[PDB]
Design a protein around this ligand. Structure first.
Ligand SMILES: Nc1nc2[nH]cnc2c(=O)[nH]1
Ligand SMILES: Nc1nc2[nH]cnc2c(=O)[nH]1
Ligand SMILES: Nc1nc2[nH]cnc2c(=O)[nH]1
Ligand SMILES: Nc1nc2[nH]cnc2c(=O)[nH]1
Lengths: 121, 121, 121, 121
């Protein structure tokens, strides 16, 4: 992904397998979320080892929490697209990849999920 | 994959590690199947959180079941290619990736498998 | 990988985590090998579900066995390169990816390994 | 990655899940590090099975140890960028991918991390 020409000047921040329990469905279900945020090196290269010099990666879990807390989600696309739109709404974000999946959708499958990858023009 | 130019306007629906037991071989054997379906955002962006607004991802498991139920499969290519052809036969599908594998083909390997990735022109 | 332009008309045959025990080192050690073979669809699309219609994927494990059986291997590159050269030496092979790794090289790492990816011109 | 045009003439050396314990934070924490080093085939193709013919892959763990041993690291970017700069500082290295992650950053996530991928011009 960091080989893509629009992303070659970026670092990747990533959140792996963030689980939440929520009401979702077209009791609560487990949903597993993965996020990749692409932020420019020129905006996120610390030279004083200070948090203010980078994009705080706590924004990924915060954005998922905000989206899940809105309630009333039926489709995985609704949640996935909302997390991606939230995370794109930041000046220092160039691109985002978000997947959601339901490990318990089917007894004979590990998961079924939805993924988007959005890059700013 | 969603960086590929023909897929940049798509979301990815995915089915991870769908296991089936079937007669296959050039008793039943376990076969593990993975599917990625690429569907255009323009056709699958819900604005009312309704299932009719998207491509129902149950189509992946349904298509595998239909193919496995035909019986008389000897080669992994026969099954893999049939699942891919079935899933391409939908107006809102742009591309599909399908892999099949046999975890028990060899005692000293985790799996041997076959994968195809087909994109509509 | 099947999005690469030279590989778009290929299927991928794969062998996941083939373990062998052998003398290797610059008692026996465990080495884990992964192989991807890219073969043209035009040469490997069965229409009669017969093995003669495809490239038999047993060739991957056979080639690893032949290379390991030669003995006297010190470097991972020597083994990896030999497996790749063996598997390229077939008319219906367009490309091969081979990795070798040593899970026990270091107590505080899962593995250290070497990978090559060779495509015929 | 070995399909990328600048890397097509390279092999990949890789270190998977190197764990360290260190003080890091914007007691010690566990940090998991992954490294991919791209080195030209023309510089690393052994024909006599001798270590002097290749880039010794012990350099990856050595460089991580040197960086961790400097102490006083607050941000993951500081560590990740330092490992990448160290490993690029070798004539036979064409590119490097380095990720760091903290498995224990959040109770409901497997990890949060940072990755860079640097290629020499
Ligand atoms: N695409 C899609 N299909 C479904 N089928 C059942 N639930 C869903 C969902 O959330 N999204
Ligand atoms: N390519 C291929 N080789 C095999 N060798 C044994 N079974 C098979 C199969 O299903 N496909
Ligand atoms: N590149 C490389 N470095 C090593 N250092 C120790 N063993 C090896 C090996 O097999 N290959
Ligand atoms: N990007 C980034 N955000 C953080 N938030 C808390 N620690 C860190 C860190 O090391 N890097």
């Amino acid at each position: 992904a960091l080989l893509h020409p629009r992303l070659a000047d970026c670092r990747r921040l990533y959140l792996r397998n963030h689980e939440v329990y929520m009401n979702i469905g077209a009791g609560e279900q487990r949903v597993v979320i993965n996020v990749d945020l692409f932020v420019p090196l020129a905006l996120t290269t610390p030279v004083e080892d200070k948090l203010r010099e980078v994009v705080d990666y706590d924004l990924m879990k915060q954005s998922v929490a905000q989206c899940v807390a809105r309630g009333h989600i039926h489709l995985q696309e609704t949640l996935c697209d909302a997390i991606a739109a939230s995370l794109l709404a930041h000046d220092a974000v160039r691109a985002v990849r978000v997947s959601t999946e339901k490990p318990d959708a089917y007894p004979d499958c590990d998961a079924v999920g939805v993924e988007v990858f959005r890059i700013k023009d």
